[model samples]
Target chain A: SLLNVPAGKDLPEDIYVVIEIPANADPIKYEIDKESGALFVDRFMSTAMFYPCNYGYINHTLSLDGDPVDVLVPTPYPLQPGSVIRCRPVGVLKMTDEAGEDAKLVAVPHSKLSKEYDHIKDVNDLPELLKAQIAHFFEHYKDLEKGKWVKVEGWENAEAAKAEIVASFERAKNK
Target chain B: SLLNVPAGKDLPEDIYVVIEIPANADPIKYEIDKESGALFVDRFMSTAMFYPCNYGYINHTLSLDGDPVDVLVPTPYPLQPGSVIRCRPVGVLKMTDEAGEDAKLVAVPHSKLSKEYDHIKDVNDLPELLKAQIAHFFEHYKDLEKGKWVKVEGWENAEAAKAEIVASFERAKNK
Candidate 1:
């Protein structure tokens, strides 16, 4: 099953992600049902803001929220939902949502079509505008929802992102 | 022919854009062949940067560069190449390239899938990060090309974008 897939054969630098949502989609959120290995609707976003990039989670890794480590992969095309993609984490969005400590790792796909992003070795290497857009999306995505708040602590470099992946992997293993 | 179609039966607010390139594609550019109404290869970008959004031209409108006025439509999904979509102009990016005065119009698709963007009337209504990304793409898209320089004059509101469209339509009609 996809859930059993290792985080990556090469660890943080070559991690794998399972795409649950593609970029530019409506606010309908989806999640992978761990027990049945099926994709299910999580909830519809109350705000009009859409995801700025492809979003999903790392395989065989667990975050503080008790779910898989959330990831955002920026690509030009909309990745197929439920597809597993190889990527390299470049940064992390330090954030806190209703669920608490919901930091999101940002990565770039390792596909030929997305080689343009290969130069990004660190979050600072990303275009300032793209970084801003990502942060903005998270900030306002849940604006209209009630009794929910998100605090963006800011950004971290690639090393930090990699460290998060490593910790999450260990957490999943412990579970 | 798609080229012969009216720029917009309703003018600037509701215009027709023929998408020649989908977002997140490789640097290979495509353009519609006016003679045969077929899509053809334009050229590969020297830079590795890919288009930030769905890009094409306005029907029956001519710009100072003597081609159809270029338009950029940001959508969640990668739009099909060669498809015509109806969109509403919300802003303009005033830029100059090797060919001179190559401004691009920014629009929101008038479709159910993109209803989230319905609230965006003026360019200011757009997320600042998105606006910055669009500008960044144009400013650096041709960076690797020899002797190809792009100057971003800045942005204009919906009224200015509409004016440019009206003028382009008149230019095409005169031609």
Candidate 2:
């Protein structure tokens, strides 16, 4: 999870934060720190997932078999961490947990991407910063390196298999 | 918001997040990059001050009378970053602001002394961590930095300053 501390001292005693439930109202989970009232994750509803890609820019190539085509997605956002609900630091935890092994943190959008980001305007270009393996864990009950899995489901299908693995996240989220 | 595109495919789409506010709900303005989806600041909420100091061990020393005391001000906590909201990692972003100020950031708990913090098993140990500013931050506000500006607000005297701070926070929340 990532967080930001407010910049001013002239703050209220208590502030109410509002989080909206998507059209589907997915089961959500917000974060809080009891010892010190850190209201970072305002609330948790559910993973708001869209088919193919839910967030971030995607790099796709033309080919009936290669992974989904590259595409960039943008949202007209007015929310920030410490603002209301932190959005840029997308998922709370960016990790991969093998069945019996500990969850390895692959990347966190919160801190890693903060240095050169633009909050008001648009984030220019970014590489494959992080991969999504949420569906694989929730559905397959397995932890695999995103985009690095060897078999990729249908090993025989080659390129189609790669696409399958990449889309696995979208497939599971929709399900 | 510089971006990098891998071969062949276009750049990955940046995620954009929106935090909608309820009508007439004293709103806090926040922003994130549409391209990189980086959050800027967490405006509106209260602050959780982190007074950097050495952690307490078993036998720290102290002076009773006219000398400065090395023992931490015990207030049920150690003036943490979050209050009752469980301190967890959330979103992070490295983004530039509309003002051109660069920042390395992520989401953190809003306030470590918020009312929700009362949920902790013990609130008495707090003074151990909080520094002078926190005590006055809850009290006169001005005394926080330069040290007690207005004879310490809530506390009957300097002796009870820390406790008074804790009490005020609790009272503010009605916890």
Candidate 3:
């Protein structure tokens, strides 16, 4: 009933991404209610900083941070949060906030890739500055809350990032 | 009857560091119970990665993370976490774990300078590799517990780091 779209052990190679919403379309953070099967605003980001990338949660994955795994979709356009959009994880932004590990999986919209963005193999494959920009946003987003920070350790390629997601998947049930 | 060492109102200029004990003296994490007038083990780190540098908390300072501000002494020898020594803060390591921010201030023993050491002015005043190494150690220190991580944001120079400490000092009592 929840967003348990099966990752089916073939992620990155086979997993279909379920986008809760697309990039720059909204400022409200959205989430799905497990029992009720509905999407709702979890919170609002400071208008000063909006989602720089298409953002949503991954299906069939639970993270150590006690949230559905987060996915940062790189697309030329926005999609509704509940829309089922296909994408493959290209890398992971190894991130941590006050809540522990909230690593975001970086994916490319497989179904809607424009010629300019269709070839991202690993996180490094993108221009380095873009990566830095992503890191900068997460690092300072919480300064107003008594100055909390996010640490972006570095980027991991698809294989390593996928391995991380799978480990979280394996540990999901226990959580 | 405890370390009341001060970074001074002229910090980045003059300060006293409170080192509870000399390094290599003990393996336990030591702290002074401000209320109980005793030093005790706060916890233990696995022998797998012993303290890479001298560690202690700053006097009269409280971090936003709800612990006494931490100081990482860079002397060649070990110092008890409870020992009070004089030194100036050169920089700070901005760190975060799953728990929250636990940033460590870096300093050199004004009284115990070693030739190869002793000259650190900021995190970067040391060699770039050395700074990277420090970041590396903290970034992976918690892997044993379900693969946790710490993010080292960047270095803050003496003034900025001292300003941070002062802010912590101001906020400590209220917290």
Candidate 4:
């Protein structure tokens, strides 16, 4: 049912994201089985580092990896896995994994929980340390895994992030 | 003039903090010179890591270090150095540096900018990763310098944090 949800109910600027892994949890990866709409344990993270933020996917959007676009939501508290939240894109982490180009969108919650983040209009608005932490987490989260590699290309602004979302939404529609 | 400001203008529950080093800035450490009430560069942080939160001190509260009690305020955005903000203590980082028992108070903003953090009543409410990041930063920030040591005793809840503030306030008053 969640898979059938619109990528953006009204405007593309506001998108819905389904949280798969809450921030600060153990390095156990989780994912949604698109066919059955069931949340499943993907695997134990190969590295010792924990996720720095709430990680999930944008509904009704498909990326180059043939999965829903990935998103990272930073909140003061850990969010519930399998819960859905509206988000406003702030930036994109241009990264590539063993699979292919995988860009993770960075966003802030766009609901009542958003007042604290009202100042964060773009990725640059984020604290430098927080931005660095997020970058460091992704760059080294798979360091110990044999044959698994991740390369961080860099970061892009909110406009680029939104464009990626729009492209993914179109890809999903065509499929 | 900020040095003379009351630690708690109204109640001890809400304390005023003067920010020194903003989160994500260069490892160049800055501190307020208590004697002159001027902000100055203390030293370059020895560690490669950046500060994970807004670093400052509770005004008019003297700790065992013979200075104002230290505080680490985690905000979505980096606060301006030398600016004062009202905060609600949520916990304490029981730490011992080269100086001695240097407990760092953990707090959330108590002003109009605090709505997003209203749910964070205690340190336990913080995201696990964020808590870990803070611990890691303080634990190893001085690792590069020989003779410098920091031991994190652990974390205490809001009650203990408030007690530390009250005690420090008394110490300042008697000094």
Candidate 5:
């Protein structure tokens, strides 16, 4: 049932983008359940594509973030801005690459030190579509000062990687 | 007792941080437990702090992203990055300012009309000192696009207010 919840107050308005994620062959990776909401996501999260946003309920029980939800139905959960109604699919990992990484982090715990090196492998799974999402999130980001998280200090390297992808995309697209 | 997890052989010399946070905060927050390790954060968290390059145990309580954490730790979680790990007399609020205007966010019910408005409120509870510690969870943010989320499309009023705040901060710090 596509419902409507008009805003009683003004919300952040920068740029809203409709993302089209390709039907994934992988097991439904991430689901944004009620749990995904509540907390704040940083301005950008490509390096992780991880945040606590809800996916809302969809027709498919085994769907990822892109699961075409039935429609906006009001519920008692938090979701990212600009939604018909917030519905978390189930979990975020099941929808995107995060699911695979979550499993890997647990399956292979390092005994003091394992084999991976630098942050290269840690970033392997991230795709361009996910990277673009966070970039859009930051552009319309409403908070000032520290309303959202920014990559600083140790996270600088990873942030740089996201920037590279954005730049390359711009070149290819002739932006 | 401080349990140390050596860096992986290929891991870079950067901070392998993961900031997992819960949805709300009646309690304080912390990082993923270094001993056990959880991938994505689970709930409005408790207190656990760490400095750079610390590997919080994958307590098996990871979020959908597979990053380890039960939730984002609020201030009052513990000592800052430099100080020793110990519970302190800490206090944080999701709201700032006596007027309650600085960092106020609300969870809107799912709706169709709501898709064009701001939904998530400002994460007013963020701490200046905790940015690095908490943002580490978003380490791979580099993989995401840049300059995309700075402006959300719908609400110009909120966006303008936020922009002013940022400009003020930039001038204050001389950055």
Candidate 6:
């Protein structure tokens, strides 16, 4: 009955990846259709920054910031918008924004050992340079619009990331 | 020949405020007219977030994020769009968004001691609760759009804030 339904503690061991912006594509941000809840490209970049990683949102859960919690999907190549993949939450990015608090859950596709982060517990073990690049990319992406920026507070383990997922599920209860 | 011609190092002690979104009004974000340097309601918020403070940009300077550097004027009441207020740069909020780096330069009126912010230095100097609210308001205000959020990275002193002004001025020179 709700537009954003959280999985809560019932989260599956293998989560799903809902792709919005693919890698190497134009960095146009997409959103869910309020009317039909479908994904569509919102706008093109008026700024210099573009999508450096695979950007998307979790299905069936809305963060406290009033949207589906954001996710950065790691893959060898880009996936198309509306594409979905079965993955697991490896880690999370604690994000503070101008208007709200947000959590960006980092998920890896099944069967991918990947590079630095292979599991939820390993996020903290990632190199500082890689983490800084991630933060640097998202923080300054709001160039076209005035008075906007994002802060990547730090990285979190899978358990902490899951807690927020369940919490977001609760926030969507009355909605 | 540019709409935003920065004063550079020759900046006047008293800065002028270019009003964009006035307080106690609709939450539509405005942009400066590139042709005549006039202000126009650029777009309405797709989310519920609106302007709780007087929002605008600095004159004669452009930040790395492109566009005239953003500014928030502290006043007892809001002014109309395109209105300019003679003020001084007190402090600044280093805001990071999706596009690029940005500085939310805070300004105080010329002859007014004003309320709350007397000498803009560290946001912590202003009261903890109030500072959190400022972050809270902006953190979640990007509700109308998706994949959009702002992070107030840190607070900057007046001299540092003006350095950004001149830097933005230089950024505009190649534009």
Among these predictions, the greatest DockQ belongs to: 2
lDDT by residue (B70-154, candidate 3, tens digit) is 7777675566555675667788888777658777787776634445555566666866644654565565434344556677787
TM-score of 4: 0.52
Model 3 residue A92 CA deviation (Å) reads: 1.0
The C-alpha stretches of model 6 lying farther than 4 A from their native spots are: A1-12, A112-121, A125-129, A173-175, B1-175
Let me know the TM-score candidate 1 reaches against the reference structure: 0.52
List, residue by residue over B88-149, the lDDT tens digit for candidate 2. Answer: 11211122223221111111222231223333222232343432433433343223344322
Better of 1 and 5 by DockQ: 1
Give the per-residue lDDT of model 5 (tens digit) for A65-121.
Answer: 222221111122433332332111110211112222111000111122323321222
Give the docking tier of candidate 2.
incorrect
TM-scores of the models, in the given order?
Answer: 0.52, 0.23, 0.46, 0.52, 0.19, 0.45
- Residues A83-157, model 2: lDDT tens digits: 232223211221223322111111112223244333322111222332333323333322222322222221112
What is the per-candidate TM-score for chain B?
Answer: 0.94, 0.18, 0.78, 0.95, 0.19, 0.79
lDDT of 4 by residue, B1-175 (tens): 8667767665567888899988767667998888898999998653335677898998877888878889998888889999988889999888899889988888888866568888999988987767766776677666556799999989899989988888888887786
Off by over 4 Å in 1: A111-114, B1-175
Candidate 3 lDDT over A1-175, as tens digits, reads 4455676336545456666656644346677776576987776543223455777776667787877678887676667667765676788888777778888888776634455656677777876655755665566445344456677777788887778667777777565
Q: For model 6 chain A, give the 10-residue run with minimal summed lDDT.
A: A1-10
Q: Residues B1-175, candidate 1, lDDT per residue (tens digit)?
A: 7757667758978888999999877667999998888999988764435677899999888899989899999887889998888899999999988889999999888754467788899988988767766776677665555688899999999999999999998988886
Clashes of 1: 2
lDDT of 2 at A145: 20
Give candidate 5 regions above 4 Å deviation: A1-74, A77-175, B1-14, B20-31, B34-175
Better lDDT candidate (3, 5): 3
TM-score, candidate 5, is 0.19
- What lDDT tens digits, residue by residue, belong to model 1 across residues A88-136? 9999999999889999999998754467888899988988767766776
Cα RMSD (Å) per model? 9.1, 20.4, 18.9, 12.3, 23.5, 14.7
> Tens digit of lDDT per residue, candidate 5, span B15-39?
1122332222233334534554333
Docking class of 1: incorrect
